[PDB]
Every structure is written in C-alpha cells, then in structure tokens.
Write a protein that binds this ligand. Structure first.
Ligand SMILES: Nc1ncnc2c1ncn2[C@@H]1O[C@H](CSCC[C@H](N)C(=O)O)[C@@H](O)[C@H]1O
Ligand SMILES: Nc1ncnc2c1ncn2[C@@H]1O[C@H](CSCC[C@H](N)C(=O)O)[C@@H](O)[C@H]1O
Ligand SMILES: C[N+](C)(C)CCOP(=O)(O)O
Ligand SMILES: C[N+](C)(C)CCOP(=O)(O)O
Length: 485
C-alpha cells in the first residue's frame, strides 16, 4: 500500500513536469534559485567520480552533476519525469537514465561501484522500514571512502501549496541519524564497514525564506569499522534506549542524563576556568546539554563523543541551527584516537563507570591533554567496603566498573596527573537524588501521561534504591580534578 500511495502522490505532482510542480510552494522559483547552488556547494568531492542520483526528477541537479562527474546514473520512479530529464540532459554522454523505484527488490546496483549517492527529498517518501532497507543497500553500493548525501523535510510540511492528500513522512532528524549510523556491512574477506557522519545541517536558503530550520541534510562517508559493536548495542538497547534517555532527561533536567542537571554542571564547569577559544573534549557527551552550556557561556569549542547511537542522534537534532561551537561523534572513548596535546580540558560526567579499564583510559587522557590543561570527572563510585548482595546485583545488571574514591584518585596520579583532587560528594549526590525524586513524585500525573506507569515506577524505585545504597555507606559519587603539568 505504501508504494501505491507514494507513487500516486508523485504521479499527481509530476503531471505538469515543471520545477514549480515539484516544489509544491508558491515561491518555487526563488527557492530554487537560492537553494540549488547551496545544495551543490554542500556535496562532497565527486569530480571525475561515479555518482548515483536517486529521485532525480526532471533534472534540477542532473545537468550540473553531469558536468563534473565521470559517470552519472539518474533515477526516478516516474517514467515521464526521467524521460523529461533525459530529453534535456541526454546530450551528456556520461549520463545513464533509469526508471526505477529505490525500494524495489529487483533494483540492481553493483556493490562497491559508487563514489557518491545523492538524493534531495526522497526518504520522506519511504516507509520507516523502506528507509532502513535502502540505507543498508546504499552502504554496500558505495566504495570505502565513498559518500552518501540526503536531505529531507523534517518535523512538518515545508511548502504552502494545497494538497488533497499527502502521504509524506515528516520525521524527527534523529530517525535518519540513527538509521544510517546503525548500518553495518562486511565484505567476503571479513572486513567490516560503517558510516561516519561528515556533516548535518539545515539548508540556509529555507531558514532565510521560510524562517524554519526543518530542511536538513546529511553527509556520510563509508569507513572501516574494526570495533565489535556489541557494547554499543547494549547501551542503545538497554539502559539508553530512546525512552530510557528521555525519561532520564525528565528526571535530571533538560539536556542532561546525569546527576543534578544544569545545577551541578554550572558548579563543575566553573572549576575549569574556561577561556574563549579553548577546546574541551566531553567524554560521554550524551544528548549535549553540558556541551551547549560550555560553548554558549564560555565561547569554547566542544568536541563531544558518545558510544550510544541514540544519544548522538538526539544531540545532532538539538544542535541544528545553533551558533555555538560544538561537534558530536559516535565513538568509543577507549578506542578513539586523537593527537597528543589536543585539548585544554577533558570533561566527563557519570560516563567512566561504563569503562572497564580506567587506567588505560586515563593514560590516554594524559596524552590528549595539552600541557597546562585540566581533567574534570564526576563518576559513580563505591565504598571500600565489600558491596552488599543488592548493590552487587545493581552493578552487574548495569555493567558498571566501580572503585572507591581514593583509588580512583590514585589511578589519575598513576597515569601522570598532578595535583589530583578526589572529592567524595556522596552527601551532595543524596541531596540531589531527593530533589529529583520529589519533583517526579509531585509531577506524577504529568510523568505517567508523557511516559507510563511502568516508567514512573522504574524511576521512583531506582531513585529510592540509590538513596538506600548511599545512606547505607555503599554507593558513592566522586568529583575528580587534576592538571597536566
Ligand atoms: N521510491 C522512489 N523511487 C524513485 N524515485 C522516487 C521515489 N519516491 C519519490 N521519488 C522521486 O523523488 C523526487 C522527489 S522531488 C525532488 C527531485 C530532485 N531531487 C530535486 O531536488 O530537484 C520525485 O521526482 C519523485 O518522483
Ligand atoms: N566507551 C564509551 N565511550 C563513549 N561513551 C560511552 C562509553 N561507554 C558509555 N558511554 C556513554 O556514557 C554516557 C553516560 S550518560 C551521561 C551523559 C552526559 N555526560 C550527561 O551528563 O548528561 C552514555 O551516553 C553512554 O552511551
Ligand atoms: C519540494 N518537495 C516537495 C519535493 C519536498 C518538500 O515537501 P514538503 O515539505 O513541502 O511536503
Ligand atoms: C549513570 N547515569 C547517571 C549516566 C545514568 C543513571 O544511572 P542509574 O543511576 O540509573 O544507574
């Protein structure tokens, strides 16, 4: 049924075979004039390379692409439309034209043959499943080092034209970020590949003309993928499933997934003495609230990494249109490489409990920090006492690696850091837990409506259990600060 309703929409809106008919907007001409060159300027390098254009239409871009590309395939599922394209651009000897549906089980494209797959409005005309299947196909079609560009209306309809029916999917940007980042291929020799997100941004011509930032494009590059992705999947499927992230955010505060939300962030960031132009690495950046805060308040550049595809998908969505200097990447902090002496500050909030080999991580932090730089970490810890049975079960289910506060400080000293401060902030942690829990209980009706009774009970139960384990001299919270001399 999806194929029928989507094709019928394009049969109707292709009948006139004009740019205006495609644009579905009263200011089609001016939008085209301003946005066409912008899209072209955003494409990754493809001169002399092999390009596939999906949903080419009557050919707004096809002619331009043909002038640069070594080889071009222009594809559309409306035969009349691709015929019109060919009537105009067929004189380019390097262009092949196809009438095909990108979702077809019979569509044949040779794996590892393409340098760029380009579309501009396409995935919004596919079902969720169709997008997932096509994304995986696309990763196979491009060579390692090749690129994918796509652009969609997100959130809601952009154009002002009257439409009797409309099957378009207006998605949140995080859907596209997640689906493409989740793709994985493996060749017959056993080598694994995935995409790296090169850029994601809104189209300026539409911000200027339509006063909204819903026209969003993505650029991805196919790269070698050497790490097993099992732990990433555990994060995205269990503790940090999207609903888990959103319910945690409700408790902790907008933009945060850890202790105290903005309040603790303001307190800890102050200790950094951030100066304009400095560069901060945020290890475990989550949904980005602390990064936006540092960048906006202090005029620093923040490099944020997080292993969770869900987390980064949220962060990239929330970063759209912002003037502050932040970049986000899906990466494992235990395998990621940076040059020595890259960062003024390394910052991490309640993330390193997920890391099993902290000494190895801290030795890397020592290298990555500039001389004179600072490391600031908050993290879950334990008493030097042996954990109770209940505390041990919590630790096991979460997969946490917990140490006592003194020992954690010692690991920083052993990694080479100077003037290590290791503060037991468990009393503050308990005060924060109570405030967070009291707010949830007070706003119970709104919480259950937005989430569920189960979600509410999970959060209330989890916070009460933390209060108990903290009161009982078991679970701890530490703040650690040190310098590289
Ligand atoms: N499943 C599908 N397979 C192939 N083409 C499709 C398709 N779904 C939509 N299309 C085509 O995608 C185009 C979207 S309109 C944009 C056309 C062009 N990318 C440009 O920006 O000018 C339409 O021409 C439509 O017919
Ligand atoms: N090996 C690893 N590399 C990078 N991030 C990791 C990681 N292991 C766990 N994480 C991330 O650690 C984060 C903890 S949640 C806290 C996020 C943010 N610092 C905030 O305070 O709001 C999760 O988003 C999780 O995906
Ligand atoms: C221009 N276009 C019609 C192909 C894409 C935008 O669609 P819409 O957001 O107006 O529904
Ligand atoms: C660890 N965290 C603060 C990032 C998220 C919450 O974990 P938990 O307190 O539910 O175990």
């Amino acid at each position: 049924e999806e194929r029928d309703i989507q094709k019928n929409y394009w049969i109707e809106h292709s009948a006139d075979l004009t740019v205006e008919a495609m644009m579905l907007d009263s200011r089609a001409s001016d939008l085209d004039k301003e946005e066409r060159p912008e899209v072209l300027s955003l494409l990754p390098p493809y001169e002399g390379k092999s390009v596939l254009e999906l949903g080419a239409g009557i050919g707004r871009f096809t002619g331009e692409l043909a002038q640069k590309a070594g080889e071009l395939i222009a594809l559309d599922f409306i035969d009349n439309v691709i015929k019109k394209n060919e009537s105009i651009n067929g004189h380019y000897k390097n262009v092949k034209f196809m009438c095909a549906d990108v979702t077809s089980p019979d569509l044949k494209i040779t794996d590892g043959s393409l340098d760029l797959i380009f579309s501009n409005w396409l995935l919004m005309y596919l079902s969720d499943k169709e997008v997932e299947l096509l994304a995986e196909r696309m990763v196979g079609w491009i060579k390692v080092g090749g690129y994918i560009f796509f652009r969609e209306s997100c959130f809601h309809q952009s154009g002002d034209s009257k439409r009797k029916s409309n099957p378009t999917h207006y998605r949140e940007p995080r859907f596209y970020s997640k689906v493409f980042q989740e793709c994985q291929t493996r060749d017959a020799a056993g080598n694994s590949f995935e995409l790296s997100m090169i850029g994601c941004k809104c189209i300026g011509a539409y911000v200027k003309n339509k006063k909204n930032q819903n026209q969003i494009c993505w650029i991805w590059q196919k790269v070698s993928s050497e790490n097993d992705r099992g732990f990433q999947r555990f994060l995205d499927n269990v503790q940090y499933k999207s609903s888990g992230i959103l319910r945690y955010e409700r408790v902790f505060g907008q933009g945060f997934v850890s202790t105290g939300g903005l309040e603790t962030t303001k307190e800890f960031v102050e200790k950094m003495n951030l100066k304009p132009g400095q560069k901060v690495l945020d290890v475990g950046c989550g949904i980005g609230g602390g990064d936006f805060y540092m960048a906006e308040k202090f005029d620093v550049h923040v490099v944020g990494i997080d292993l969770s595809v869900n987390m980064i998908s949220f962060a990239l969505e929330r970063a759209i249109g912002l003037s502050c200097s932040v970049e986000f990447e899906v990466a494992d902090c235990t395998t990621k490489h940076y040059p020595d002496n890259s960062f003024d500050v390394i910052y991490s909030r309640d993330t390193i409990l997920h890391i099993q080999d902290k000494p190895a991580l801290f030795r890397t932090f020592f290298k990555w920090l500039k001389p004179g730089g600072k490391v600031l970490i908050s993290d879950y810890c334990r008493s030097p006492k042996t954990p109770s049975a209940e505390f041990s079960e919590y630790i096991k289910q979460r997969g946490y690696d917990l140490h006592d506060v003194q020992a954690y400080g010692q690991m920083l000293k052993d990694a080479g850091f100077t003037d290590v401060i290791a503060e037991d902030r468990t009393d503050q942690f308990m005060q924060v837990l109570k405030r967070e829990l009291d707010r949830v209980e007070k706003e119970k009706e709104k919480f259950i409506s937005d989430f569920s009774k189960e979600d509410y009970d999970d959060i209330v139960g989890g916070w009460k259990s933390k209060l108990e384990r903290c009161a009982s001299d078991e679970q701890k919270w530490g703040l650690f600060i040190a310098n590289k001399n």
